[PDB]
Paper text:
Multiple strategies have been developed to modify monoclonal antibodies, including chemical conjugation and protein engineering. Recently, we identified a cyclic, 12-amino-acid peptide that binds in a cavity formed by all four IgG domains of the cetuximab Fab. Owing to the location of the binding site within the Fab, we have termed the peptide a meditope (medi-, middle, + -tope, place). Based on our observations, the peptide–Fab interaction does not affect antigen binding. Herein, multiple crystal structures of meditope peptide derivatives incorporating natural and unnatural amino acids bound to the cetuximab Fab domain are presented.
Next, we turned our attention to leucine at position 5 in the meditope peptide.
Residue numbers in the entry:
A (entry chain E): 1 to 12
B (entry chain A): 1 to 213
C (entry chain B): 1 to 133, 138 to 220
The structure:
Amino acid sequence: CQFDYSTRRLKC
Amino acid sequence: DILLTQSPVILSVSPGERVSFSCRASQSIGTNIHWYQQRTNGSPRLLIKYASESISGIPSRFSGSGSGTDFTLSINSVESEDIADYYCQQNNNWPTTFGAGTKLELKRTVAAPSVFIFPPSDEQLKSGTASVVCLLNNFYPREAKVQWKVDNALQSGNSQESVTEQDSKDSTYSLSSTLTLSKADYEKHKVYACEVTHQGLSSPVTKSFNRGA
Amino acid sequence: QVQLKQSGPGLVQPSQSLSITCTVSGFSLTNYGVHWVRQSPGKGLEWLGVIWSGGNTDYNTPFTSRLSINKDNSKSQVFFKMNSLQSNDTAIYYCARALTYYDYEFAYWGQGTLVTVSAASTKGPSVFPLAPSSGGTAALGCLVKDYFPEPVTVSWNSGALTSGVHTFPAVLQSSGLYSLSSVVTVPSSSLGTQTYICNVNHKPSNTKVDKRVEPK
Ligand SMILES: *[C@@H]1O[C@H](CO)[C@@H](O)[C@H](O)[C@H]1NC(C)=O
């Protein structure tokens, strides 16, 4: 997974 | 630097189940591990310090254990508010480093979406662009299809979707699909429709409007 | 009440420098070190450095050359500066405080500062109503369109309306500008009684817009 700085959540 | 490997990458559980996060260090680090929770749009939140020691204000269902290279964060009964990412951190060895994280997803019963369609506002049409919005509200699971049709012509490539993270209360998702046209094209057509397909619907559901009314 | 409040999000040009201020309260900078952590797509959570109680600094090895941390004890402010930013330096930057004055157990965090490294220009958003047109429940919202960079905050009725609110993640359009929608479901019988306003704040452009949403 990769961190998404728009939601501050891991986006996989 | 110490490499921290968190497994699994994604954890999917049901409410009430026990759940365990794993953090494996590239070499022995004693008990010098800290755990963090990150909710949607939040900053990291300290859950456990030094493998197992408690943190003020953290619910008692959170606990930790392990020593050496293998560490475990546990939730004895996960709640819908536990939906988040979880990170470990080692500080036995400068510099302090963080694992890549484990995402916690929550299963629940199938919930069909509620569908709404929004024509472009008269204010936006002054700018020469038309945004048509189709809303799929409070559904589960995440998979869903939105098919746009303008005067029965299938639209393709001129829409974009955005999906919320799992709601902390009911564990559902919500989805927005935005169809973007030029004002000239929008004024050339009448029937605007989004068709929603989802497991919770026995048939596809279509919300539509006629430009004007 | 220990708290850390950071300066607002902003855009930084490639090869330019980043500046962030962390104003602390509930404790004195003379008794606690303040750490700096960032969170990027490329490398996740990453510890950058720290300024200790007495003023000494430590910088993580890959930032020894372009990092600089200072503070003003009397004004309770910690100043973070990083030089020569590139695209992959785009991340959320936090200040943090440990549980004890010497440790790394980050119990208190700033709210974060989304730093975007891009050559583009700052642009405020336009806000368009999603006017309500099932089962007594009406849906309405706001279209927050054509802004850069992230983020934008949306509340409803100045924070008094939170139930049923969904603010969708921003999506990047082909123009290089972001767009998002924020919706809320309400009883349809309250549309003629209650006023519904979405409060849009794009701090990078200092754009603050309240949009009343009515049935058309
Ligand atoms: C940014 O790119 C440089 C150049 O390869 C790399 O050394 C650094 O780790 C990168 N930082 C990230 C991906 O956060």
